[PDB]
Design an enzyme around this catalytic site. Structure first.
Site, PDB file in Angstrom:
ATOM      1  N   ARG A  80      52.191  42.794  33.122  1.00 41.40           N
ATOM      2  CA  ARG A  80      51.478  41.511  33.049  1.00 41.40           C
ATOM      3  C   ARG A  80      50.827  41.172  31.698  1.00 41.40           C
ATOM      4  NH1 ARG A  80      51.567  39.184  38.521  1.00 41.40           N
ATOM      5  NH2 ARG A  80      50.671  41.223  39.101  1.00 41.40           N
TER       6      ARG A  80
ATOM      7  N   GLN B 109      55.720  36.822  30.390  1.00 41.33           N
ATOM      8  CA  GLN B 109      55.092  35.788  31.205  1.00 41.33           C
ATOM      9  C   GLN B 109      56.080  34.658  31.454  1.00 41.33           C
ATOM     10  OE1 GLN B 109      50.582  36.878  29.942  1.00 41.33           O
ATOM     11  NE2 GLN B 109      51.597  35.139  28.947  1.00 41.33           N
TER      12      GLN B 109
ATOM     13  N   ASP C 110      57.650  36.311  34.163  1.00 44.66           N
ATOM     14  CA  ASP C 110      56.700  36.696  35.218  1.00 44.66           C
ATOM     15  C   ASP C 110      57.048  35.986  36.528  1.00 44.66           C
ATOM     16  OD1 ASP C 110      54.450  37.994  36.350  1.00 44.66           O
ATOM     17  OD2 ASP C 110      53.110  37.397  34.722  1.00 44.66           O
TER      18      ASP C 110
ATOM     19  N   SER D  32      54.290  35.356  39.240  1.00 44.19           N
ATOM     20  CA  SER D  32      53.540  34.127  39.031  1.00 44.19           C
ATOM     21  C   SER D  32      54.291  32.901  39.562  1.00 44.19           C
ATOM     22  CB  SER D  32      53.200  33.954  37.545  1.00 44.19           C
ATOM     23  OG  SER D  32      52.484  35.075  37.043  1.00 44.19           O
TER      24      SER D  32
ATOM     25  N   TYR E  69      36.544  48.379  38.216  1.00 41.03           N
ATOM     26  CA  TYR E  69      36.675  49.104  39.481  1.00 41.03           C
ATOM     27  C   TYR E  69      35.896  48.444  40.632  1.00 41.03           C
ATOM     28  CZ  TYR E  69      37.852  52.524  35.786  1.00 41.03           C
ATOM     29  OH  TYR E  69      38.367  53.145  34.671  1.00 41.03           O
TER      30      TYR E  69
HETATM   31  N1  NAP Z   1      48.711  31.312  33.394  1.00 40.77           N
HETATM   32  C1  NAP Z   1      49.255  32.402  33.938  1.00 40.77           C
HETATM   33  O1  NAP Z   1      49.936  32.350  34.947  1.00 40.77           O
HETATM   34  C2  NAP Z   1      49.024  33.731  33.286  1.00 40.77           C
HETATM   35  C3  NAP Z   1      49.584  34.898  33.811  1.00 40.77           C
HETATM   36  C4  NAP Z   1      49.339  36.106  33.165  1.00 40.77           C
HETATM   37  C5  NAP Z   1      48.541  36.103  32.020  1.00 40.77           C
HETATM   38  N2  NAP Z   1      48.012  34.961  31.523  1.00 40.77           N
HETATM   39  C6  NAP Z   1      47.177  35.000  30.305  1.00 40.77           C
HETATM   40  O2  NAP Z   1      46.361  33.834  30.101  1.00 40.77           O
HETATM   41  C7  NAP Z   1      46.129  33.663  28.694  1.00 40.77           C
HETATM   42  C8  NAP Z   1      46.067  32.195  28.300  1.00 40.77           C
HETATM   43  O3  NAP Z   1      45.631  32.085  26.945  1.00 40.77           O
HETATM   44  P1  NAP Z   1      44.758  30.827  26.453  1.00 40.77           P
HETATM   45  O4  NAP Z   1      44.861  30.748  24.950  1.00 40.77           O
HETATM   46  O5  NAP Z   1      45.133  29.622  27.284  1.00 40.77           O
HETATM   47  O6  NAP Z   1      43.257  31.267  26.844  1.00 40.77           O
HETATM   48  P2  NAP Z   1      42.573  32.577  26.202  1.00 40.77           P
HETATM   49  O7  NAP Z   1      43.488  33.123  25.137  1.00 40.77           O
HETATM   50  O8  NAP Z   1      42.134  33.488  27.315  1.00 40.77           O
HETATM   51  O9  NAP Z   1      41.254  31.992  25.483  1.00 40.77           O
HETATM   52  C9  NAP Z   1      40.139  31.495  26.227  1.00 40.77           C
HETATM   53  C10 NAP Z   1      39.012  31.152  25.259  1.00 40.77           C
HETATM   54  O10 NAP Z   1      38.254  30.022  25.703  1.00 40.77           O
HETATM   55  C11 NAP Z   1      36.912  30.155  25.227  1.00 40.77           C
HETATM   56  N3  NAP Z   1      35.904  29.557  26.142  1.00 40.77           N
HETATM   57  C12 NAP Z   1      35.585  30.004  27.374  1.00 40.77           C
HETATM   58  N4  NAP Z   1      34.617  29.240  27.942  1.00 40.77           N
HETATM   59  C13 NAP Z   1      34.294  28.277  27.061  1.00 40.77           C
HETATM   60  C14 NAP Z   1      33.344  27.135  27.023  1.00 40.77           C
HETATM   61  N5  NAP Z   1      32.528  26.869  28.069  1.00 40.77           N
HETATM   62  N6  NAP Z   1      33.317  26.367  25.908  1.00 40.77           N
HETATM   63  C15 NAP Z   1      34.123  26.620  24.860  1.00 40.77           C
HETATM   64  N7  NAP Z   1      35.008  27.639  24.826  1.00 40.77           N
HETATM   65  C16 NAP Z   1      35.141  28.491  25.875  1.00 40.77           C
HETATM   66  C17 NAP Z   1      36.649  31.649  25.105  1.00 40.77           C
HETATM   67  O11 NAP Z   1      35.897  31.919  23.919  1.00 40.77           O
HETATM   68  P3  NAP Z   1      34.284  32.058  23.933  1.00 40.77           P
HETATM   69  O12 NAP Z   1      34.003  33.143  24.945  1.00 40.77           O
HETATM   70  O13 NAP Z   1      33.934  32.440  22.515  1.00 40.77           O
HETATM   71  O14 NAP Z   1      33.760  30.698  24.324  1.00 40.77           O
HETATM   72  C18 NAP Z   1      38.026  32.299  25.113  1.00 40.77           C
HETATM   73  O15 NAP Z   1      38.289  33.015  23.905  1.00 40.77           O
HETATM   74  C19 NAP Z   1      47.266  34.362  27.970  1.00 40.77           C
HETATM   75  O16 NAP Z   1      46.723  35.271  27.009  1.00 40.77           O
HETATM   76  C20 NAP Z   1      48.042  35.090  29.054  1.00 40.77           C
HETATM   77  O17 NAP Z   1      48.278  36.459  28.716  1.00 40.77           O
HETATM   78  C21 NAP Z   1      48.240  33.791  32.137  1.00 40.77           C
HETATM   79  N1  NAD Z   2      45.890  39.664  38.516  1.00 37.33           N
HETATM   80  C1  NAD Z   2      46.168  40.920  38.882  1.00 37.33           C
HETATM   81  O1  NAD Z   2      45.919  41.863  38.145  1.00 37.33           O
HETATM   82  C2  NAD Z   2      46.798  41.176  40.225  1.00 37.33           C
HETATM   83  C3  NAD Z   2      46.765  42.448  40.800  1.00 37.33           C
HETATM   84  C4  NAD Z   2      47.360  42.639  42.045  1.00 37.33           C
HETATM   85  C5  NAD Z   2      47.971  41.559  42.684  1.00 37.33           C
HETATM   86  N2  NAD Z   2      47.997  40.338  42.113  1.00 37.33           N
HETATM   87  C6  NAD Z   2      48.629  39.181  42.768  1.00 37.33           C
HETATM   88  O2  NAD Z   2      47.643  38.415  43.470  1.00 37.33           O
HETATM   89  C7  NAD Z   2      48.223  37.805  44.628  1.00 37.33           C
HETATM   90  C8  NAD Z   2      47.253  37.783  45.813  1.00 37.33           C
HETATM   91  O3  NAD Z   2      46.486  38.987  45.964  1.00 37.33           O
HETATM   92  P1  NAD Z   2      44.870  38.985  45.815  1.00 37.33           P
HETATM   93  O4  NAD Z   2      44.547  39.693  44.519  1.00 37.33           O
HETATM   94  O5  NAD Z   2      44.361  37.581  46.032  1.00 37.33           O
HETATM   95  O6  NAD Z   2      44.278  39.879  47.031  1.00 37.33           O
HETATM   96  P2  NAD Z   2      42.676  40.020  47.238  1.00 37.33           P
HETATM   97  O7  NAD Z   2      42.011  39.659  45.936  1.00 37.33           O
HETATM   98  O8  NAD Z   2      42.251  39.333  48.513  1.00 37.33           O
HETATM   99  O9  NAD Z   2      42.402  41.596  47.426  1.00 37.33           O
HETATM  100  C9  NAD Z   2      42.811  42.322  48.587  1.00 37.33           C
HETATM  101  C10 NAD Z   2      41.710  42.473  49.645  1.00 37.33           C
HETATM  102  O10 NAD Z   2      41.572  43.853  50.018  1.00 37.33           O
HETATM  103  C11 NAD Z   2      40.212  44.165  50.356  1.00 37.33           C
HETATM  104  N3  NAD Z   2      39.838  45.568  49.940  1.00 37.33           N
HETATM  105  C12 NAD Z   2      40.430  46.291  48.962  1.00 37.33           C
HETATM  106  N4  NAD Z   2      39.877  47.530  48.834  1.00 37.33           N
HETATM  107  C13 NAD Z   2      38.902  47.634  49.755  1.00 37.33           C
HETATM  108  C14 NAD Z   2      37.919  48.675  50.166  1.00 37.33           C
HETATM  109  N5  NAD Z   2      37.865  49.883  49.553  1.00 37.33           N
HETATM  110  N6  NAD Z   2      37.070  48.379  51.178  1.00 37.33           N
HETATM  111  C15 NAD Z   2      37.102  47.183  51.802  1.00 37.33           C
HETATM  112  N7  NAD Z   2      37.965  46.196  51.483  1.00 37.33           N
HETATM  113  C16 NAD Z   2      38.880  46.345  50.484  1.00 37.33           C
HETATM  114  C17 NAD Z   2      39.355  43.056  49.739  1.00 37.33           C
HETATM  115  O11 NAD Z   2      38.484  42.487  50.726  1.00 37.33           O
HETATM  116  C18 NAD Z   2      40.324  41.998  49.222  1.00 37.33           C
HETATM  117  O12 NAD Z   2      40.062  40.699  49.773  1.00 37.33           O
HETATM  118  C19 NAD Z   2      49.516  38.546  44.933  1.00 37.33           C
HETATM  119  O13 NAD Z   2      50.593  37.598  44.965  1.00 37.33           O
HETATM  120  C20 NAD Z   2      49.698  39.542  43.795  1.00 37.33           C
HETATM  121  O14 NAD Z   2      51.001  39.436  43.198  1.00 37.33           O
HETATM  122  C21 NAD Z   2      47.426  40.138  40.913  1.00 37.33           C
END
Ligand code: NAP
Ligand code: NAD
Ligand code: NAP
Ligand code: NAD
Lengths: 440, 372, 94, 369, 90, 437
Positions: free
Chosen positions: B122, B127, B130, B133, B226
């Protein structure tokens, strides 16, 4: 002298008017013409100053003085302008110093205040003269641009001046015509000395500081003899010049005291107003929204600004990065909310070859999506499709402090020569941005 | 000069296809031969002739996999496909070992190179690949559409000369790719929405759309990453305040899943019983378990008035766009297997090495090594 | 501070604050031409040197006053020309 | 001291309750006694104990009509309540004789006073009583929901890591009350919407909500200037427009007439695979020709849905509005808490279907022969 | 006190353009308390009413000056207390 | 060459800097810190005026003026503040006409132009004094009136003025005691006759008009007596009041010259509270009705309860909402609303189509869409865009109108609903119903 004072009163007003209109975006052009007619009338009125003599001498010093300058300015290039102001500024300090010496050689006043303001105006004049010519010589390359130091100069400048003062004050009790030019050359000398340690890049702020110095001088000298026009215009430029000095030091991310001595790129802070400046006058603007806009719930203050631009006829387009935000289509929904039309919403592939013709690029709360680290395979940002925001002729970024994106890398776009930074909360800044643009 | 295949999926109720005629068109523009089965895109309303115009080849199953170097599947390929495998061929696509345990152990007897699409890391690189997503996006959408279709209530705050109708209160329990998607569309309609999760980063992702995040007397997360391990004095208040907040809700959309285990339960029998009649329980976690106790897979049920729905394949119902989003995921991933229209796999890559399920009868994925 | 003492002391401070407020809240892209505009405005030194030259007595007063009129004429005629050419980059080329 | 009765609606597939318990309370505090049958609001999720908490008497169906003066029905009363009625008693609720002719003839043979809820004036004075208004909005909102549900396409525009999704182009044909809320909800979703109507005033109300109107040019007020040149101005123009469509919601209706054929056969052939047509006017014919009433059909690749009784599906709010429609209508029949109808107010005079048995409405009286 | 014609007309003009531009950048929020101050400021009208009262001799001259100081000091101390509490509301 | 002059120079700077610091909001607080010392400094300095007599009499009139007004200023309610400016504006005007009066009985002008600046200041002094006393009479209520507007008054008012002018100009060659009185009487006559065709509303545009006048009066008298503080401050006040009158005339629906379809849909207090709690963006639009009932204290209590729930609350402030300048300002001050919730029209107008509920309290003309077109009377109005909001709630007793004289077409639109009753009797019912949800 009712006709001259009434003229010098008409002359007084025209300057202030000229000064006012030359400060504003739209009246800027017309401001100088208002001040142009004032000089014609004032000089035309002093042709009728009672007891005017040496007319064939007055007309020639007007002739060879009005053309020598007019010639030097119209022909030269567009980048040698910083030094040209300095030298014209220099001669103006000389011109005040020359009025000072004459009535000092006459013994024309026994008044102890008038003399003191004639002398004190003559000091700063000769300093503002020889200072602006040394300032003139540094940008031209005739003289070493870098700061010129010699061992223990903080006690050479300060004792050359300390005498220039004590000798100036001596003209009150003893105005012998042998301690006057030594006072004048001491100021023509301190003029050279104090414009030696200033850097070649530190020179503009020095020219504005001498521009105040000339202005001040012609105020005090204008007071020393019964001359209303000089009284008006002098301190009007003087008081303008010192404010002019500090604000020009405020922009260079420094302070006036650092320049007075001072013995891949960098970040650039811009105030909320100067951004609205570049935005009131552009033609092709593109908003780049990121996750920061979301946390601020800015969307409504952004669309409000975009409409304010569409009205001024400015071409507004929105560049949504595929991964802008934290979820897919994060911006699309928050822009569908504010009521942004979908034709204004274009993706990377049809907007990237359009960036070299984009003037200002306003990034709002975006970071990783705009980062030019994504082109290189060595970064954790590669593979992601890239938005060519850096090719835009100018860039303005919006975010509170140093906070990073998701992946966790610094952005070298912030450091760019064509990129400027705006700090604070997102919608809190756009609100200040909308407020400043309607003011212009 | 490489060749890549795309099949007709066999899993019950699947209406998708791995590659669409558009992405196929630009890959033959890339420089490759495309092999397609007879009627694979018919679920996504792309006819048989839609691919032939692109430059591919429409044939029958069995004749499809003789010669190919790349296979592009939605769900894990079945018996008759697994056996049709050549050595040095790469199996791209969803596997989900825990649910398709049979189709997994079948791939080992023929020693084929499989890469599971669910194990795409991720960071930023993939992405544009991805799939996690892209498809949970489609699901979370319909999750809200069905919620307004089945709700006996206005999602919008409806104001007329007749009277004042308050907007329906919706709770998204589990905030992920589908969750955020569900949250958004719920506010599109006008519903006042709530978002339950444990990650303090997910609770921030929620309010960015306009939702009030559910923080119980016991925030289950803090500093580092955690989540909390509740003893006997805390998983009850997590449950009780979680039972009282849910009680005053009209729609509960639930999306909590794990990559290797059956869905953990958010809506218990007693939380279920304290629900008012007219309440809608939406359960996307049904494809691997289901967050609500009373959820039965693929069927709509009603008891004490509460309606509970559990859909296996949402991308199938919105098959047109889902497939289109899935094909480019493979296309930007074809940037890691295809080189100028020539079979150039990249075993060095961090997306590949961090997603490769096997290397010719060789399970790299420790967890997929774990389940066998 | 004369004609008479208090009257022009007012004038001085009344001009000190007026010039100040006129330059508060000025944009950044117009920082140098207004400085070129003020450079011209304080070129008024001519009018006072014209008088000083028109009242030249001792012959040594005849040359140093002749200098000042040129020195001032250069600040003025040179100030105007530097301000006009800076304002034409703020106009489109027809 | 007046008595209001609420019956259980027993038509094939209805869950709308006439009075919700929350309204009965305004009437019990408004001076009246209300009688409710055992298990009436259990379709709209209002239990027995909810009604008895307000101030009502839960009774048997035969026990329902003992002394009651006013009868508030949702759909026209079946004939087992037409007979248990009282003299001078006045029934309130949809009567609609095009599906209930024989039940209508049953009320006129018995000599009971009746008021029909499809006869309330369409001026802004009587918008607080208007049933079909509160029962066309509930359908139109759902007209958009079912459109998105059955749609294999996205309604909003979304810019993701996987391409640029374009918005579903939705047309809402015949924009009345059902047409207005079928646009806004589709707009809420993020769809590019269009709206067609024969009237100039329903093109401006549609543009008001945000949609760009289809290209004219008739009058027909108010299928009159529509049949001048005999619908070759209706069939000619928007055949090329519908060719860009992803969705078609049709609500177009004429009071008592057949639904004007808006979507023919050569129009639905230019339609793309995955296109959706929602036809609310399925209860008196069809705007489209392929609408099988009450069934999800699919030909060539275009799904056709003909939804009967959409307020039934959104029972809790449809009933909540309908009861308020009835409560605000009860201010002309109940004075402080005593049976006091207004025979002289213009709203009752244009709606009184039968008084003492005699059918007062124009054609109403026509066919029965 | 000795104040000339051209010296005064400049002052006149200078403080005119001074105040003008101070008041240019006022928020709507200030208009009323800001009005209360200018009302107070011109309460310096006591000074003149005091100067002229300390120069009265006849029986009718001494009265209107006593009238002018009560009005003046009332414009003075009255403008101050209405704005102190108006600025307190911050 | 003197030390009484030196006080006045420090006196004027404190006036100007105060003014400067008063003009802007962040430093306005330290503003009255600066002018108050300029008033404490000036009074003390004139005790040292060479050869002053009647010293017992001056100090008495000082305490009699000071303590009487100091008391009246603190003990009067905050809403009754517009006329307090006018009456002090009167006091000063009277005190300005007095400086003209005594220095014409002595025959103490050795210059023709000085008399012409002494008399002209008294002209302005008497007018600005007596007019502010009639303005006073029409805001207070013991003999309140709208415009009296008598037939052909513009001909007889312009007659009186011209007759005062002829009496005034008669002092140059004939400084007779008789020629002094009639002049003052006519100036005090015109000053009144002039504030006859003025509306009990338009008074804000008249008080500052009289405030600038008092400034001019003080200016000219200073030039006449050779007094530099009254010279500088006078014109430092007048010109400020001048621009002030115009800025608060054009902020009005009006200029500096005019002074001299649908159906109503009712709603219950319980139905209106339901709109508030779920409403994200709420905007309160207050007017005269909030003032008459004294509802202010029951309005902030609704603004805080919405904010405790989360509701984004802002206050749209029409510069002309009420019966004085910033009537909303000082009441939304007396209650304790943060000024950052207080937004004038131009910063809050493009925020409305997204304002979930725009609650309007006791306001009509400020939010009347008639101000847009050239046909209706309300034209020239900086319009408050409340009609574009998604839901509008209006608070007023029954079927009453505002000032200009038109019914509101905002009431009838499909989006707006009315809330009938006494202003604070409505809001308390809104709070306590919202408390029940
Ligand atoms: N969209 C998806 O499905 C998806 C999936 C996986 C990963 N991602 C990740 O999402 C990221 C998107 O990047 P991005 O450039 O759009 O965002 P970003 O790189 O996370 O940058 C967000 C910036 O906005 C600023 N900010 C936050 N609150 C603010 C406020 N109230 N006023 C002014 N500035 C503020 C923060 O700086 P300050 O704290 O200094 O304000 C922060 O550095 C990617 O790096 C990607 O890896 C997205
Ligand atoms: N962004 C990420 O890093 C990440 C990680 C995993 C999954 N996902 C994605 O997110 C989507 C939805 O999943 P989600 O993250 O909304 O699920 P979620 O946030 O609801 O988490 C799972 C649930 O398990 C329960 N739980 C876990 N450990 C527990 C413990 N020790 N005791 C009691 N309760 C416990 C929590 O109540 C929680 O609501 C999926 O499609 C998946 O692909 C994303
Ligand atoms: N403030 C200024 O600067 C100023 C100065 C001069 C003139 N004006 C003029 O005045 C107008 C200002 O409009 P506005 O909207 O501020 O006020 P307005 O239009 O005068 O509205 C006053 C309304 O308040 C209502 N009201 C009074 N007492 C009430 C109570 N106890 N409870 C509930 N409602 C009550 C009345 O309606 P009900 O009788 O129905 O309750 C009345 O219609 C403009 O047209 C402008 O030209 C303004
Ligand atoms: N205050 C208001 O503005 C308001 C509110 C509610 C209702 N009304 C009135 O109530 C009336 C009834 O509306 P309804 O909801 O019962 O209508 P409906 O639900 O039966 O829908 C029919 C709609 O289709 C349109 N239509 C008719 N013939 C057509 C054709 N041949 N092709 C295409 N479209 C066609 C009609 O204009 C009508 O709006 C409307 O005429 C309206 O004026 C007004």
């Amino acid at each position: 002298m009712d006709l001259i004072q009434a003229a010098y009163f008409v002359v007084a007003i025209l300057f202030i008017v000229g000064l006012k209109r030359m400060a504003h975006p739209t009246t800027a052009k017309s401001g100088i013409v208002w001040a142009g007619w004032g000089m014609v009338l004032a000089v035309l009125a002093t042709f009728f100053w009672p007891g005017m003599g040496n007319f064939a001498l007055i007309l020639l010093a007007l002739l060879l003085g009005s053309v020598v300058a007019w010639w030097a300015a119209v022909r030269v290039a567009m980048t040698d302008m910083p030094q040209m102001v300095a030298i014209y500024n220099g001669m103006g300090g000389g011109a005040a110093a020359t009025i000072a010496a004459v009535e000092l050689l006459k013994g024309a006043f026994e008044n102890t205040g008038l003399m003191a303001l004639a002398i004190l105006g003559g000091l700063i004049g000769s300093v503002a003269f020889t200072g602006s010519l040394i300032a003139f010589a540094k940008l031209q390359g005739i003289m070493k641009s870098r700061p010129i130091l010699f061992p223990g100069q903080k006690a050479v400048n300060a004792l050359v001046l300390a005498l220039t003062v004590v000798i100036g004050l001596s003209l009150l009790w003893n105005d012998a015509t042998a301690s006057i030019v030594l006072f004048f050359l001491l100021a023509l000398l301190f003029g050279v000395l104090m414009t030696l340690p200033i850097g070649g890049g530190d020179m503009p702020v020095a020219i504005s500081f001498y521009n105040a110095f000339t202005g001040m001088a012609v105020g005090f000298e204008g007071f020393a003899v019964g001359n209303p026009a000089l009284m008006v215009a002098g301190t009007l430029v003087g008081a303008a010049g010192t404010l002019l000095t500090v604000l020009m030091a405020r922009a260079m991310n420094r302070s006036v005291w650092s320049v007075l001595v001072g013995g891949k790129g960098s970040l650039k802070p811009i105030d909320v107003e100067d951004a609205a400046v570049m935005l009131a006058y552009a033609g092709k603007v593109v908003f780049v929204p990121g996750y920061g806009m979301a946390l601020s719930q800015a969307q409504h203050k952004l669309k409000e600004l975009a409409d304010l631009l569409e009205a001024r006829g400015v071409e507004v387009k929105f560049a949504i990065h595929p991964v802008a935000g934290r979820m897919p289509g994060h911006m699309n929904v928050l822009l569908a909310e504010a009521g942004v039309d979908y034709d204004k919403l274009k993706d990377l592939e049809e907007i990237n070859p359009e960036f070299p013709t984009v003037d200002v690029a306003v990034v709002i709360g975006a970071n990783d999506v705009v980062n030019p680290a994504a082109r290189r395979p060595g970064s954790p940002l590669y593979g992601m499709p890239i938005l060519d925001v850096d090719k835009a002729k100018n860039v303005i970024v919006i975010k509170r402090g140093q906070g990073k994106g998701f992946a966790g890398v610094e952005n070298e776009l912030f450091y760019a020569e064509n990129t400027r930074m705006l700090y604070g909360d997102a919608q809190k800044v756009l609100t200040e941005l909308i407020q400043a643009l309607k003011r212009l | 000069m490489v060749t890549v295949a795309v099949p007709k999926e066999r899993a019950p109720g699947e209406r998708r296809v791995a590659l669409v005629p558009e992405v196929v068109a630009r890959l033959v523009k890339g420089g490759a031969r495309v092999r397609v089965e007879r009627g694979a895109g018919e679920g996504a309303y792309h006819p048989d002739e839609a691919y032939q115009e692109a430059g591919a080849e429409v044939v029958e199953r069995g004749e499809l996999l003789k010669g190919a170097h790349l296979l592009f599947t939605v769900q894990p390929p079945p018996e008759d496909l697994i056996q049709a495998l050549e050595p040095g061929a790469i199996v791209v696509g969803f596997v989900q070992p825990h649910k398709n345990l049979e189709l997994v152990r079948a791939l080992q007897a023929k020693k084929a190179t499989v890469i599971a699409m669910e194990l795409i890391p991720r960071i930023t690189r993939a992405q544009s690949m991805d799939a996690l997503s892209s498809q949970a996006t489609v699901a979370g959408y319909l999750a809200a559409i069905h919620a307004a279709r089945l709700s006996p209530r206005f999602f919008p705050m409806l104001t007329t000369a007749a009277g004042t109708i308050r907007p329906a209160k919706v709770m998204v329990m589990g905030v992920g790719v589908a969750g955020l998607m569900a949250i958004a569309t719920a506010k599109r309609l006008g519903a006042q929405v709530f978002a339950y999760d444990v990650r303090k980063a997910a609770l921030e992702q929620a309010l960015s759309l306009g939702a009030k995040p559910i923080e119980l007397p016991i925030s289950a997360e803090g500093e580092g990453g955690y989540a909390r391990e509740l003893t006997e004095e805390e998983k009850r208040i997590q449950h009780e305040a979680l039972r009282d907040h849910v009680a005053g809700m009209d729609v509960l959309i639930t999306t909590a899943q794990v990559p290797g285990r059956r869905a953990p339960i958010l809506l218990t029998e007693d939380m279920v019983e304290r629900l008012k009649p007219g309440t809608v329980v939406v359960d996307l976690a049904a494809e691997s378990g289901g967050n609500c106790v009373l959820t039965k897979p693929g069927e709509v049920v009603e008891v004490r008035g509460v309606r509970v729905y559990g859909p296996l394949n949402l991308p199938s119902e919105l098959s047109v766009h889902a497939s289109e989003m899935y094909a480019k995921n493979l296309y930007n991933l074809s940037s890691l297997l295809i080189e100028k229209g020539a079979f150039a796999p990249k075993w060095e890559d961090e997306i590949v090495r961090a997603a490769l399920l096997m290397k010719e009868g060789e399970v790299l994925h420790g967890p997929t090594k774990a389940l066998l | 501070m004369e004609f008479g003492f208090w009257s022009a002391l007012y004038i001085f401070v009344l001009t000190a604050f007026l010039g100040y407020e006129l330059i508060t809240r000025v944009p950044v892209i117009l920082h140098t031409p207004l400085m070129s505009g003020s450079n011209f405005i304080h070129g008024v030194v001519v009018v006072g040197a014209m008088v000083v030259l028109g009242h030249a007595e001792t012959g040594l007063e005849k040359l140093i006053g002749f200098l000042g009129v040129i020195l001032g004429a250069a600040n003025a005629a040179g100030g105007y020309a530097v301000t006009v050419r800076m304002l034409e980059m703020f106009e489109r080329k027809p």
